[PDB]
Amino acid sequence: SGISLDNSYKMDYPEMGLCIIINNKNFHKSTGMTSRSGTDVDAANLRETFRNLKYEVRNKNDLTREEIVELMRDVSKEDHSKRSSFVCVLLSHGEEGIIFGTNGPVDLKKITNFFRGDRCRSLTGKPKLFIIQACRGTELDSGIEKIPVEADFLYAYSTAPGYYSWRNSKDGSWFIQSLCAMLKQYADKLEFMHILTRVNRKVATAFESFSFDATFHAKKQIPCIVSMLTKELYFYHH
Template identity: 40%
Template sequence: TQRDKGYLILASEEINSGSDPSELACTASMSIDRDAVEYNMRHKNRGLALIFNHENFDVPTLEPRTGTNVDCENLTQVLKKLDFDVNVFKDCRLNELKQQLVSASQKDHSENDCILVAILSHGEHGYIYAKDVQYKLDAIWSYFTPQKCPSLAGKPKLFFIQACQGDECDPGVTLNRRTETDGDSSMSYKIPLHADFLIAHSTMPGFCSFRCPMQGSWFIHALCTELEMNGKRLDMFTLLTFVCRRVAVDYQSYAPDTPKKHEQKQIPCITSRLMRILRFREKRALQ
């Protein structure tokens, strides 16, 4: 198992959204009633899904991310089944990545339910890598604010980030079920230290993220499994809770020659600012 480990390098350029604090509040068409419990997922189209898949890098200290193409293929297939218009971009340099984000933000999303952006790359806390340099991840969201993309105002904007956020590893804690027989460990299992807390980062800030060269990363594999099984049945918050459980319980690193990396755990970090329930309703049934 390999880690999506990044190295701190000062980029010659970071994504600059061009945001101006003096910008006035904008107005946009209402896509849903003020007090609606669920997002309106009955538009003509589901929406765009942009996948930025980074395998090889110009930065000498960054190793190729073997296994990322498995993640990309799995994610592409499951998002197509959820009726997304999927666009895959391989090994983009920063300027190329910026151009694709600007292009997407300038489209008319009036007939779309939402937008989804997935980034598969190396990273450090607060930074992620394009092919040539690193940039601040926070800048990506700003391309899709109502000022930049009014046709997405009031609609879900989803970001999935598969990348390390640091070098720390999570050794986990073993939970034992109390039984009448002391030492009965048949119902014991190991979970991360940071479990039971509930953005969709593959790991906690400061911690590494694990990836298998053959099966892809733990997080994307679990995410695709849940989207495949429950993507049109469960709401997104519930689904991501199940993703957290899969990553936390079903996976453990195997690196016996490197004790610090051996038998380590991982927990995704999901931060939600959604205001309503999000459910990918069946498109064919609505048309």
């Protein structure tokens, strides 16, 4: 055959892969964590968006820290040989490096480790995407105007390190709303990083918080793309 290039991930396997959506809205009273109103809009938006991208979506609601770990481990033990990639969306409360189960925290590292190049062989060399809508701290943005086991991972964080992440009780989170809109519009045209860059701009420009509390009013947000990917990612093929 002619000259061949390996600049982009092979996305023409029989299946695009799984899209696991962990939607945590209601938390155990003892944790003291509030209900995440609007998260169902996010979960529904994501399901439809990835459905159109041909992913095998599995929506899970209100999972405990134990159930999250068990789910991830079981999914990582599946045979992904015929799957092009893997997507996991986490919608919940959080802190830096942590996402909350309904009854307690789960280190993000524990979840992602199940999918390491050496622990999930059927996903080795394939893109593993973790989309996280959760806080990464308590800072507010005031605004102005052999291959590595950690390789082939992409973390599409909703907010910058150490910052709160915003969610609208009626429209859903700023990040997820934007992510889904950008995917629906550009998934058949742009490489993934370029799509996520559009998401960054949308969140950064079109949203500003409104709150009766001066401390939380007029705040801005910027998502955080973290890539360990080794190739360009296009959801379309041929």
